[PDB]
Swiss-Prot record, chain D:
Organism: Bacillus phage SF6
Protein name, per record: Terminase small subunit
Name of encoding gene: 1
Record function comment: The terminase small subunit specifically recognizes the non-adjacent pacL and pacR packaging subsites and regulates the ATPase activity of the terminase large subunit. The terminase lies at a unique vertex of the procapsid and is composed of two subunits, a small terminase subunit involved in viral DNA recognition (packaging 'pac' sequence), and a large terminase subunit possessing endonucleolytic and ATPase activities. Both terminase subunits heterooligomerize and are docked on the portal protein to form the packaging machine.
Residue numbers of the full-length protein present here: 53 to 120 of 145
Family (UniProt): Belongs to the SPP1-like small terminase family.
Keywords: DNA-binding, Viral genome packaging, Viral release from host cell
């Protein structure tokens, strides 16, 4: 199991650590279909380019499962 | 073991956190075949375009499993 | 584990949440071979089109496993 | 993390069909005995494909057998 | 876990339900290398045909593992 | 877990069921590199033919793991 | 289970060992969409080049899951 | 779990069953990089031939893990 | 579970065995994005060459998970 | 679980069985980036050749995990 760090210590950490409520906010954005991911897309003859697509249903369902357990 | 956050705290959170009942609404839309996902589709010679398809049966069945356990 | 929501609360929810019996009806349709999924099919030279095919045996067997446990 | 169990009397009077335990095992048995088919895409040349039916694979028959062996 | 149904009830069922001994007979045929599966085989230029091949080693070893546990 | 059947009942079964010792004999043949599996091999331009190859190391190691636990 | 080393011993170690709070800072950067990974991208006719793409949604969701458990 | 058969019965079995110590000898040969597996190798234009390659690092590491647990 | 060898015996072993703290140092290098792996990269028409790429995000996240657990 | 064989019996075995300390030495070589594996590399038009590449990061991380648990 992951080491649990006091939420007061996460808050005063100079570099950002997400709190429990912020984890759920980010999972919520994914679950609501508001996020994108960068993937490689073919443009002809083996060549590819970077593009952004909506987060897949399998990843939204994983986010929903985690939200349902929280 | 996701941290469990009080539903009253989710409600007063400035940014949206999905509540338990809203998780089940979203899983229900998926299970009923009402949702789409964005995928890459070939259009010739290796080139692809973004398009929307129905959520696959494997993902609907995962939604149904989660609804059956809730 | 998924939060369990009272079936009375699912019923009065404004937006649809599937009840336990409705989960089993949808799994049953899959298991009986009555459902389809949308997939990409090649039509020549890398081009593809959307089409509907029967739900695969692996997904029917997963539906049957869930019905056997419910 | 277990499926809600519904009384078999309630399944029977449900308006829409819910498979009973014995009917689940009948459908797994058909698969296990090699009597079922699935629809797949088959190449017909140069990237073109067509829909066709093939026998259920051995991996899926073995999964049906495993489930029948546990029931 | 799968519901267990009385073997007397399986026997009187009009449609065939495999009994525990019959499951082990079918696994045994697979394990002994007596079974085939239908697969798609290339015949040139992306065209395919249906053919029968022996059940793979990975599937025989799964059958053997199950027989070893039964 | 798989239902474990009395070795006297396996013996009286009309059709053959592998006994515990016969399972370990077949696993041993695989582990010792004595078995083959049928696979599809390319012969040019997308065409394929059936041929026999030695059982892979991953499958031999699985056989060895099972023998080590028996 | 991984051997647990005293955080005082990690601190005086000559070579860097990440402390608990630093693990969470790195997971947070991933979860917030601030990190990249190096992958191979096609540039034509089977040739490829190295490029940087955003960390995928599946890996962000794993970082979020771990942060939710810490 | 696999049925455990008396090592005296393995020994008097007409056909060979590997004993515990022989399982570890075979795993050891794999771990030490002394074994090969047969694979299909391309020789041009989709044609392939059978050849032998060293057992992969993933399979050696699995052998090492099993030896470490025995 | 892996056989546990006394850390004093690991230290006097003629050939190197990594101690717990050294395992964590190496996981840390990975997690901090300091390591590379050798992969095959296409250079045209099916030919490939060996090159070094950064360790992927999935492997960094595994390192971070292990560090977070101990 | 693998049968546990007395280290005194491994030592007097005529054929080599790796002892616990020798398992850890081999895992250590892998973890330190000192080992190679044989793979197939394309040389043009579908033809391939055998070559040696560094063990991948995923396999190093598995070796490090195992060393961390020993």
């Amino acid at each position: 199991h992951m080491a649990r760090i006091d939420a007061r210590l996460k808050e005063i950490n100079e570099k950002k650590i997400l709190q429990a409520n912020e984890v759920l906010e980010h999972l919520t954005r994914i679950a609501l279909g508001q996020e994108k991911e960068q993937v490689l897309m073919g443009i002809g003859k083996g060549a590819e380019t970077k593009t952004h697509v909506e987060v897949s249903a399998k990843d939204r369902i994983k986010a929903l499962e985690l939200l349902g357990k929280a």
